[PDB]
Amino acid sequence: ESLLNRLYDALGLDAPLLIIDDGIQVYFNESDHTLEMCCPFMPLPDDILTLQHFLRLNYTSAVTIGADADNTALVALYRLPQTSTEEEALTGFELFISNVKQLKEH
Amino acid sequence: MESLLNRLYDALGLDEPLLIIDDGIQVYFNESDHTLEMCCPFMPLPDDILTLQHFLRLNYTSAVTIGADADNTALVALYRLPQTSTEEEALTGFELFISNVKQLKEHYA
Numbered sequence: 001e002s003l004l005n006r007l008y009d010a011l012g013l014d015a016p017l018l019i020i021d022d023g024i025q026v027y028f029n030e031s032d033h034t035l036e037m038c039c040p041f042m043p044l045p046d047d048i049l050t051l052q053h054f055l056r057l058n059y060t061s062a063v064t065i066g067a068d069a070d071n072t073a074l075v076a077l078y079r080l081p082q083t084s085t086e087e088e089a090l091t092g093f094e095l096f097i098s099n100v101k102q103l104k105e106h
Numbered sequence: 107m108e109s110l111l112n113r114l115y116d117a118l119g120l121d122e123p124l125l126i127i128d129d130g131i132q133v134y135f136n137e138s139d140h141t142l143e144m145c146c147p148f149m150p151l152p153d154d155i156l157t158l159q160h161f162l163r164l165n166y167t168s169a170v171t172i173g174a175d176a177d178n179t180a181l182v183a184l185y186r187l188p189q190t191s192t193e194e195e196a197l198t199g200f201e202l203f204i205s206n207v208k209q210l211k212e213h214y215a
Binding site: 046047051052057059065066067068077 | 136141143145151153158163166169171173174175176
């Protein structure tokens with residue numbers, strides 16, 4: 001029973017990518033013995049100060065900022081080892097969504 | 107009860123700010139209420155668009171988080187560990203961190 005499947009059950013979701021009308025797309029990556037949550041929240045900036053700002057945010061945040069391989073957007077990230085329990089996964093998901101909403105504020 | 111960071115220091119055979127040098131790798135710690143953060147400043151903070159975007163992309167693929175320190179002086183590799191973790195998880199985490207940063211630095215720094 002994969003951690004991803006574990007999270008879904010914990011969330012009550014019955015999937016046979018998770019999109020929420022909060023204008024949020026969550027992608028899951030289960031490679032490297034871990035569960036990674038990813039959410040592209042805005043286009044990749046070309047401004048030095050803005051880029052440094054997101055790297056600074058990574059110094060103190062549980063939810064970190066990265067850039068997709070396609071180099072088209074900044075993505076909020078959060079990883080957990082597959083060995084994690086369904087309770088830890090659930091908690092991680094809750095924290096992730098809250099931070100993504102925060103990142104989209106202005 | 108001794109704090110988790112103090113127990114790590116003991117495990118590292120150590121008896122206040124502090125900088126560790128393990129195999130040429132610099133490691134210092136930051137703390138918050140619920141988290142102990144291991145930090146390795148591995149190179150000066152780049153000031154060009156492309157290198158900065160590159161490190162943001164690396165964040166997506168690298169096992170360890172890459173960020174910039176508070177003074178905007180260095181690019182830093184880091185690992186967050188719950189202040190509720192066991193002494194052993196702290197030590198093992200520290201060792202794995204060093205291992206990850208060593209390779210990160212030699213390939214991207």
